[PDB]
Design an enzyme around this catalytic site. Structure first.
Site, PDB file in Angstrom:
ATOM      1  N   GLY A   1       0.794  -1.218   0.000  1.00  0.00           N
ATOM      2  CA  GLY A   1       0.000   0.000   0.000  1.00  0.00           C
ATOM      3  C   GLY A   1       0.825   1.265   0.000  1.00  0.00           C
TER       4      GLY A   1
ATOM      5  CB  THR B   1      -2.957   9.721   3.412  1.00  0.00           C
ATOM      6  OG1 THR B   1      -4.050   9.064   2.764  1.00  0.00           O
ATOM      7  CG2 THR B   1      -3.030  11.216   3.148  1.00  0.00           C
ATOM      8  N   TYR B   2      -0.311   8.683   4.979  1.00  0.00           N
ATOM      9  CA  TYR B   2       0.713   8.906   5.998  1.00  0.00           C
ATOM     10  C   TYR B   2       2.070   8.259   5.643  1.00  0.00           C
TER      11      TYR B   2
ATOM     12  CB  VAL C   1       1.448  -0.133   4.000  1.00  0.00           C
ATOM     13  CG1 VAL C   1       1.229  -1.246   4.889  1.00  0.00           C
ATOM     14  CG2 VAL C   1       0.782   1.068   4.594  1.00  0.00           C
TER      15      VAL C   1
ATOM     16  CG  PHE D   1      -0.294  -9.235   6.610  1.00  0.00           C
ATOM     17  CD1 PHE D   1       0.054  -8.288   5.655  1.00  0.00           C
ATOM     18  CD2 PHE D   1      -0.665 -10.504   6.179  1.00  0.00           C
ATOM     19  CE1 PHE D   1       0.032  -8.604   4.297  1.00  0.00           C
ATOM     20  CE2 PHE D   1      -0.699 -10.814   4.816  1.00  0.00           C
ATOM     21  CZ  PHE D   1      -0.337  -9.865   3.885  1.00  0.00           C
TER      22      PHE D   1
ATOM     23  CG  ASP E   1      -7.709  -3.553  -0.658  1.00  0.00           C
ATOM     24  OD1 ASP E   1      -8.424  -3.990  -1.582  1.00  0.00           O
ATOM     25  OD2 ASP E   1      -6.807  -2.715  -0.835  1.00  0.00           O
TER      26      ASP E   1
ATOM     27  CG  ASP F   1      -9.038   9.135   3.922  1.00  0.00           C
ATOM     28  OD1 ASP F   1      -9.975   9.369   3.113  1.00  0.00           O
ATOM     29  OD2 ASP F   1      -7.862   8.890   3.560  1.00  0.00           O
TER      30      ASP F   1
ATOM     31  N   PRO G   1     -12.578   1.745   0.493  1.00  0.00           N
ATOM     32  CG  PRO G   1     -13.886   1.083  -1.353  1.00  0.00           C
ATOM     33  CD  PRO G   1     -13.302   2.304  -0.678  1.00  0.00           C
TER      34      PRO G   1
HETATM   35  O1  LIG Z   1      -2.518  -5.955   6.186  1.00  0.00           O
HETATM   36  C1  LIG Z   1      -2.517  -4.724   6.310  1.00  0.00           C
HETATM   37  N1  LIG Z   1      -2.551  -4.075   7.479  1.00  0.00           N
HETATM   38  C2  LIG Z   1      -2.611  -2.758   7.227  1.00  0.00           C
HETATM   39  C3  LIG Z   1      -2.626  -1.660   8.093  1.00  0.00           C
HETATM   40  C4  LIG Z   1      -2.756  -0.358   7.609  1.00  0.00           C
HETATM   41  C5  LIG Z   1      -2.857  -0.132   6.235  1.00  0.00           C
HETATM   42  N2  LIG Z   1      -2.968   1.045   5.602  1.00  0.00           N
HETATM   43  C6  LIG Z   1      -3.073   1.020   4.261  1.00  0.00           C
HETATM   44  S1  LIG Z   1      -3.055  -0.608   3.781  1.00  0.00           S
HETATM   45  C7  LIG Z   1      -2.877  -1.245   5.358  1.00  0.00           C
HETATM   46  C8  LIG Z   1      -2.758  -2.550   5.845  1.00  0.00           C
HETATM   47  C9  LIG Z   1      -2.724  -3.820   5.269  1.00  0.00           C
HETATM   48  C10 LIG Z   1      -2.788  -4.149   3.910  1.00  0.00           C
HETATM   49  N3  LIG Z   1      -2.858  -5.431   3.529  1.00  0.00           N
HETATM   50  C11 LIG Z   1      -2.928  -5.845   2.252  1.00  0.00           C
HETATM   51  C12 LIG Z   1      -2.474  -7.130   1.928  1.00  0.00           C
HETATM   52  C13 LIG Z   1      -2.562  -7.612   0.617  1.00  0.00           C
HETATM   53  C14 LIG Z   1      -3.161  -6.848  -0.391  1.00  0.00           C
HETATM   54  C15 LIG Z   1      -3.639  -5.548  -0.065  1.00  0.00           C
HETATM   55  C16 LIG Z   1      -3.575  -5.102   1.265  1.00  0.00           C
HETATM   56  C17 LIG Z   1      -4.273  -4.801  -1.269  1.00  0.00           C
HETATM   57  S2  LIG Z   1      -4.779  -6.178  -2.305  1.00  0.00           S
HETATM   58  O2  LIG Z   1      -6.038  -6.818  -1.816  1.00  0.00           O
HETATM   59  O3  LIG Z   1      -4.769  -5.825  -3.766  1.00  0.00           O
HETATM   60  C18 LIG Z   1      -3.358  -7.237  -1.880  1.00  0.00           C
END
Ligand SMILES: O=C1Nc2ccc3ncsc3c2/C1=C/Nc1ccc2c(c1)CS(=O)(=O)C2
Length: 282
Positions: A11, A14-15, A18, A75, A79, A120, A123
Protein backbone atom coordinates in the site's frame (compact mmCIF):
# COMPACT_ATOMS: atom_id res chain seq x y z
CA UNK A 1 13.89 -1.82 12.17
CA UNK A 2 16.76 -4.34 11.78
CA UNK A 3 14.19 -6.72 13.42
CA UNK A 4 12.05 -6.62 10.24
CA UNK A 5 12.54 -8.22 6.82
CA UNK A 6 10.46 -6.46 4.14
CA UNK A 7 8.61 -8.89 1.88
CA UNK A 8 6.81 -6.48 -0.53
CA UNK A 9 4.98 -3.12 -0.80
CA UNK A 10 1.22 -3.62 -0.11
CA UNK A 11 0.00 0.00 0.00
CA UNK A 12 0.82 3.66 -0.61
CA UNK A 13 -1.25 5.41 2.05
CA UNK A 14 -1.63 9.10 2.94
CA UNK A 15 0.71 8.91 6.00
CA UNK A 16 3.32 6.72 4.18
CA UNK A 17 4.21 3.45 2.38
CA UNK A 18 2.96 0.10 3.76
CA UNK A 19 5.01 -3.09 3.51
CA UNK A 20 4.36 -6.77 4.24
CA UNK A 21 7.18 -7.63 6.65
CA UNK A 22 8.42 -10.50 8.82
CA UNK A 23 9.42 -9.94 12.46
CA UNK A 24 12.86 -11.68 12.61
CA UNK A 25 12.38 -12.32 16.40
CA UNK A 26 8.76 -13.70 16.70
CA UNK A 27 8.38 -14.87 13.05
CA UNK A 28 5.21 -12.72 12.92
CA UNK A 29 4.03 -11.50 9.50
CA UNK A 30 2.98 -7.85 9.87
CA UNK A 31 2.08 -4.71 7.91
CA UNK A 32 4.80 -2.11 8.40
CA UNK A 33 4.03 1.56 7.84
CA UNK A 34 6.89 4.09 7.66
CA UNK A 35 5.43 7.53 8.52
CA UNK A 36 6.61 10.33 6.20
CA UNK A 37 8.12 13.30 8.15
CA UNK A 38 6.11 15.88 17.00
CA UNK A 39 5.50 14.81 20.65
CA UNK A 40 1.68 15.33 20.38
CA UNK A 41 1.64 12.75 17.51
CA UNK A 42 3.57 10.14 19.62
CA UNK A 43 1.06 10.47 22.53
CA UNK A 44 -2.08 10.24 20.30
CA UNK A 45 -0.63 7.28 18.35
CA UNK A 46 0.29 5.61 21.72
CA UNK A 47 -3.42 5.83 22.77
CA UNK A 48 -4.49 3.99 19.57
CA UNK A 49 -2.47 0.92 20.68
CA UNK A 50 -5.16 0.46 23.42
CA UNK A 51 -8.17 0.88 21.01
CA UNK A 52 -8.54 -2.92 20.46
CA UNK A 53 -11.63 -4.57 18.76
CA UNK A 54 -12.16 -7.65 16.43
CA UNK A 55 -13.20 -5.27 13.56
CA UNK A 56 -10.24 -2.88 13.94
CA UNK A 57 -6.83 -3.68 12.50
CA UNK A 58 -4.59 -4.14 15.52
CA UNK A 59 -1.86 -1.52 16.02
CA UNK A 60 0.80 -3.86 17.38
CA UNK A 61 3.64 -1.43 18.01
CA UNK A 62 4.88 2.14 17.59
CA UNK A 63 8.62 2.44 16.83
CA UNK A 64 10.11 5.92 17.21
CA UNK A 65 13.80 5.44 16.27
CA UNK A 66 16.36 7.73 14.49
CA UNK A 67 13.79 10.66 14.40
CA UNK A 68 11.63 8.37 12.18
CA UNK A 69 8.27 6.76 12.96
CA UNK A 70 7.14 3.19 12.09
CA UNK A 71 3.69 1.74 12.84
CA UNK A 72 3.53 -2.10 13.15
CA UNK A 73 0.06 -3.42 12.24
CA UNK A 74 -1.75 -6.75 12.10
CA UNK A 75 -1.59 -8.20 8.57
CA UNK A 76 -4.67 -9.25 6.43
CA UNK A 77 -4.34 -10.76 2.93
CA UNK A 78 -6.81 -8.67 0.89
CA UNK A 79 -8.70 -5.37 0.92
CA UNK A 80 -12.36 -4.67 -0.07
CA UNK A 81 -11.32 -2.76 -3.24
CA UNK A 82 -9.61 -5.91 -4.65
CA UNK A 83 -12.48 -8.16 -3.46
CA UNK A 84 -15.08 -5.89 -5.15
CA UNK A 85 -12.97 -5.95 -8.38
CA UNK A 86 -12.68 -9.81 -8.19
CA UNK A 87 -16.48 -10.08 -7.58
CA UNK A 88 -17.44 -7.49 -10.31
CA UNK A 89 -18.94 -10.02 -12.77
CA UNK A 90 -21.35 -11.66 -10.25
CA UNK A 91 -21.51 -9.06 -7.45
CA UNK A 92 -20.84 -9.73 -3.76
CA UNK A 93 -23.77 -11.85 -2.42
CA UNK A 94 -26.27 -9.69 -0.39
CA UNK A 95 -25.72 -11.88 2.82
CA UNK A 96 -21.96 -11.12 2.63
CA UNK A 97 -22.57 -7.36 1.92
CA UNK A 98 -24.88 -7.34 5.00
CA UNK A 99 -22.29 -9.21 7.17
CA UNK A 100 -19.45 -6.83 6.14
CA UNK A 101 -21.67 -3.73 6.70
CA UNK A 102 -22.77 -5.04 10.19
CA UNK A 103 -19.15 -5.76 11.23
CA UNK A 104 -17.95 -2.32 10.01
CA UNK A 105 -20.75 -0.61 12.00
CA UNK A 106 -19.65 -2.63 15.07
CA UNK A 107 -16.05 -1.36 14.60
CA UNK A 108 -17.36 2.23 14.09
CA UNK A 109 -19.65 2.05 17.14
CA UNK A 110 -16.60 0.94 19.20
CA UNK A 111 -14.18 3.73 18.02
CA UNK A 112 -16.97 6.39 18.19
CA UNK A 113 -17.76 5.29 21.82
CA UNK A 114 -14.08 6.23 22.59
CA UNK A 115 -14.42 9.61 20.69
CA UNK A 116 -12.08 8.26 17.94
CA UNK A 117 -12.94 9.10 14.29
CA UNK A 118 -11.56 7.48 11.13
CA UNK A 119 -12.16 10.55 8.81
CA UNK A 120 -10.86 8.75 5.66
CA UNK A 121 -12.80 5.46 5.22
CA UNK A 122 -12.42 3.86 1.79
CA UNK A 123 -12.39 0.28 0.34
CA UNK A 124 -8.52 0.31 0.44
CA UNK A 125 -8.43 0.53 4.25
CA UNK A 126 -11.14 -2.16 4.77
CA UNK A 127 -9.33 -5.45 5.13
CA UNK A 128 -10.72 -8.98 4.89
CA UNK A 129 -9.61 -12.51 5.87
CA UNK A 130 -10.66 -16.11 5.01
CA UNK A 131 -12.91 -16.40 8.13
CA UNK A 132 -15.44 -13.83 6.85
CA UNK A 133 -14.12 -10.95 9.00
CA UNK A 134 -13.71 -7.38 7.80
CA UNK A 135 -11.60 -4.83 9.66
CA UNK A 136 -11.05 -1.05 9.67
CA UNK A 137 -7.45 0.15 9.22
CA UNK A 138 -6.06 3.56 10.37
CA UNK A 139 -8.62 4.75 12.93
CA UNK A 140 -7.36 7.93 14.65
CA UNK A 141 -4.23 8.56 12.45
CA UNK A 142 -5.78 11.60 10.66
CA UNK A 143 -6.25 13.47 14.03
CA UNK A 144 -2.90 12.15 15.40
CA UNK A 145 -0.82 13.46 12.43
CA UNK A 146 -3.02 16.39 11.32
CA UNK A 147 -3.92 11.50 -5.65
CA UNK A 148 -6.26 11.48 -2.61
CA UNK A 149 -9.74 10.00 -3.30
CA UNK A 150 -12.70 12.31 -2.52
CA UNK A 151 -15.41 9.74 -3.32
CA UNK A 152 -16.24 8.95 0.30
CA UNK A 153 -15.96 12.47 1.78
CA UNK A 154 -18.99 13.69 3.86
CA UNK A 155 -20.59 16.96 2.50
CA UNK A 156 -19.84 18.94 5.74
CA UNK A 157 -16.07 18.32 5.14
CA UNK A 158 -16.43 19.49 1.48
CA UNK A 159 -18.35 22.59 2.69
CA UNK A 160 -15.42 23.54 5.02
CA UNK A 161 -16.66 22.38 8.45
CA UNK A 162 -13.53 22.34 10.66
CA UNK A 163 -15.14 20.60 13.67
CA UNK A 164 -16.87 17.63 12.07
CA UNK A 165 -18.16 14.60 14.02
CA UNK A 166 -18.36 10.79 13.98
CA UNK A 167 -21.16 11.26 11.37
CA UNK A 168 -18.42 11.69 8.67
CA UNK A 169 -17.55 7.95 9.03
CA UNK A 170 -21.22 6.91 8.69
CA UNK A 171 -21.40 8.90 5.42
CA UNK A 172 -18.23 7.20 4.04
CA UNK A 173 -19.55 3.72 5.02
CA UNK A 174 -22.93 4.53 3.36
CA UNK A 175 -21.04 5.33 0.12
CA UNK A 176 -19.13 1.97 0.45
CA UNK A 177 -22.41 0.06 1.14
CA UNK A 178 -23.93 1.52 -2.09
CA UNK A 179 -20.75 0.58 -4.05
CA UNK A 180 -20.83 -3.07 -2.81
CA UNK A 181 -24.51 -3.32 -3.93
CA UNK A 182 -24.36 -1.62 -7.36
CA UNK A 183 -20.71 -2.57 -8.25
CA UNK A 184 -20.04 1.13 -9.05
CA UNK A 185 -18.78 4.02 -6.91
CA UNK A 186 -21.75 6.14 -5.74
CA UNK A 187 -20.07 9.59 -6.07
CA UNK A 188 -16.80 9.30 -8.05
CA UNK A 189 -15.77 12.99 -7.93
CA UNK A 190 -12.41 14.05 -9.33
CA UNK A 191 -12.27 17.53 -7.67
CA UNK A 192 -13.86 18.98 -4.53
CA UNK A 193 -16.56 20.83 -6.48
CA UNK A 194 -17.21 17.80 -8.81
CA UNK A 195 -17.56 15.67 -5.62
CA UNK A 196 -19.98 18.17 -4.10
CA UNK A 197 -22.04 18.59 -7.30
CA UNK A 198 -22.25 14.77 -7.81
CA UNK A 199 -23.74 14.51 -4.26
CA UNK A 200 -26.13 17.41 -5.05
CA UNK A 201 -27.26 15.88 -8.39
CA UNK A 202 -28.30 12.66 -6.59
CA UNK A 203 -29.52 13.80 -3.13
CA UNK A 204 -30.66 17.30 -4.20
CA UNK A 205 -28.95 20.62 -3.45
CA UNK A 206 -29.18 21.00 0.38
CA UNK A 207 -31.06 23.98 1.76
CA UNK A 208 -32.06 25.35 5.20
CA UNK A 209 -35.11 23.02 5.30
CA UNK A 210 -33.17 19.69 5.06
CA UNK A 211 -29.95 21.03 6.65
CA UNK A 212 -30.35 23.96 9.10
CA UNK A 213 -27.20 26.11 9.05
CA UNK A 214 -25.98 24.78 5.64
CA UNK A 215 -26.08 28.25 3.96
CA UNK A 216 -23.69 29.69 6.64
CA UNK A 217 -21.00 27.01 6.12
CA UNK A 218 -17.54 28.32 5.16
CA UNK A 219 -17.52 27.06 1.54
CA UNK A 220 -21.25 27.28 0.91
CA UNK A 221 -22.10 29.50 -2.08
CA UNK A 222 -25.63 30.87 -2.77
CA UNK A 223 -24.61 30.49 -6.47
CA UNK A 224 -24.63 26.63 -6.14
CA UNK A 225 -26.99 25.19 -8.82
CA UNK A 226 -30.29 23.93 -7.36
CA UNK A 227 -30.85 20.27 -8.33
CA UNK A 228 -33.88 18.15 -7.33
CA UNK A 229 -33.40 14.94 -5.32
CA UNK A 230 -33.51 11.47 -7.08
CA UNK A 231 -35.40 8.35 -5.73
CA UNK A 232 -33.21 5.76 -3.91
CA UNK A 233 -34.98 3.06 -6.00
CA UNK A 234 -33.05 4.62 -8.98
CA UNK A 235 -29.79 5.14 -6.97
CA UNK A 236 -29.16 1.62 -5.61
CA UNK A 237 -31.27 -1.01 -7.56
CA UNK A 238 -31.93 -3.89 -6.76
CA UNK A 239 -31.44 -3.21 -2.95
CA UNK A 240 -34.63 -4.00 -0.97
CA UNK A 241 -36.59 -1.38 1.07
CA UNK A 242 -34.78 -2.20 4.35
CA UNK A 243 -31.36 -1.58 2.75
CA UNK A 244 -32.52 1.58 0.97
CA UNK A 245 -34.10 2.91 4.22
CA UNK A 246 -30.82 2.27 6.11
CA UNK A 247 -28.72 3.83 3.33
CA UNK A 248 -30.95 6.98 3.22
CA UNK A 249 -30.35 7.45 7.02
CA UNK A 250 -26.56 7.01 6.48
CA UNK A 251 -26.63 9.69 3.74
CA UNK A 252 -28.71 12.37 5.53
CA UNK A 253 -27.19 15.78 4.80
CA UNK A 254 -27.46 17.17 8.33
CA UNK A 255 -24.75 15.36 10.42
CA UNK A 256 -27.11 15.63 13.43
CA UNK A 257 -29.92 13.74 11.61
CA UNK A 258 -27.50 11.13 10.12
CA UNK A 259 -27.89 7.71 11.84
CA UNK A 260 -25.26 6.73 14.46
CA UNK A 261 -23.35 3.40 14.13
CA UNK A 262 -25.06 2.09 17.29
CA UNK A 263 -28.61 2.97 16.03
CA UNK A 264 -27.72 1.54 12.56
CA UNK A 265 -26.92 -1.86 14.16
CA UNK A 266 -30.57 -2.03 15.37
CA UNK A 267 -32.01 -1.23 11.90
CA UNK A 268 -34.45 -3.90 10.55
CA UNK A 269 -32.03 -4.55 7.61
CA UNK A 270 -29.88 -6.56 10.10
CA UNK A 271 -32.79 -8.78 11.30
CA UNK A 272 -31.47 -11.76 9.20
CA UNK A 273 -27.70 -10.98 9.33
CA UNK A 274 -25.36 -14.03 9.22
CA UNK A 275 -21.59 -14.43 8.81
CA UNK A 276 -20.88 -16.15 5.43
CA UNK A 277 -17.45 -17.28 4.23
CA UNK A 278 -16.15 -15.34 1.19
CA UNK A 279 -14.26 -17.20 -1.47
CA UNK A 280 -10.87 -15.51 -1.52
CA UNK A 281 -8.20 -16.03 -4.14
CA UNK A 282 -4.84 -15.19 -2.49
O1 LIG B 1 -2.52 -5.95 6.19
C1 LIG B 1 -2.52 -4.72 6.31
N1 LIG B 1 -2.55 -4.08 7.48
C2 LIG B 1 -2.61 -2.76 7.23
C3 LIG B 1 -2.63 -1.66 8.09
C4 LIG B 1 -2.76 -0.36 7.61
C5 LIG B 1 -2.86 -0.13 6.23
N2 LIG B 1 -2.97 1.05 5.60
C6 LIG B 1 -3.07 1.02 4.26
S1 LIG B 1 -3.06 -0.61 3.78
C7 LIG B 1 -2.88 -1.25 5.36
C8 LIG B 1 -2.76 -2.55 5.85
C9 LIG B 1 -2.72 -3.82 5.27
C10 LIG B 1 -2.79 -4.15 3.91
N3 LIG B 1 -2.86 -5.43 3.53
C11 LIG B 1 -2.93 -5.85 2.25
C12 LIG B 1 -2.47 -7.13 1.93
C13 LIG B 1 -2.56 -7.61 0.62
C14 LIG B 1 -3.16 -6.85 -0.39
C15 LIG B 1 -3.64 -5.55 -0.06
C16 LIG B 1 -3.57 -5.10 1.27
C17 LIG B 1 -4.27 -4.80 -1.27
S2 LIG B 1 -4.78 -6.18 -2.31
O2 LIG B 1 -6.04 -6.82 -1.82
O3 LIG B 1 -4.77 -5.83 -3.77
C18 LIG B 1 -3.36 -7.24 -1.88
Amino acid sequence: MENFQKVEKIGEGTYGVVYKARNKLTGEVVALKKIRLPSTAIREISLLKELNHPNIVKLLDVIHTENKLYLVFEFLHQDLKKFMDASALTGIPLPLIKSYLFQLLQGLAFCHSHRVLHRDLKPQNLLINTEGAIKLADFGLARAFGVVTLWYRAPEILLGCKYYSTAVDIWSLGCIFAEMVTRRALFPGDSEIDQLFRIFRTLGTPDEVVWPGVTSMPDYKPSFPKWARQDFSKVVPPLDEDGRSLLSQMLHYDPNKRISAKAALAHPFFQDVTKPVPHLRL
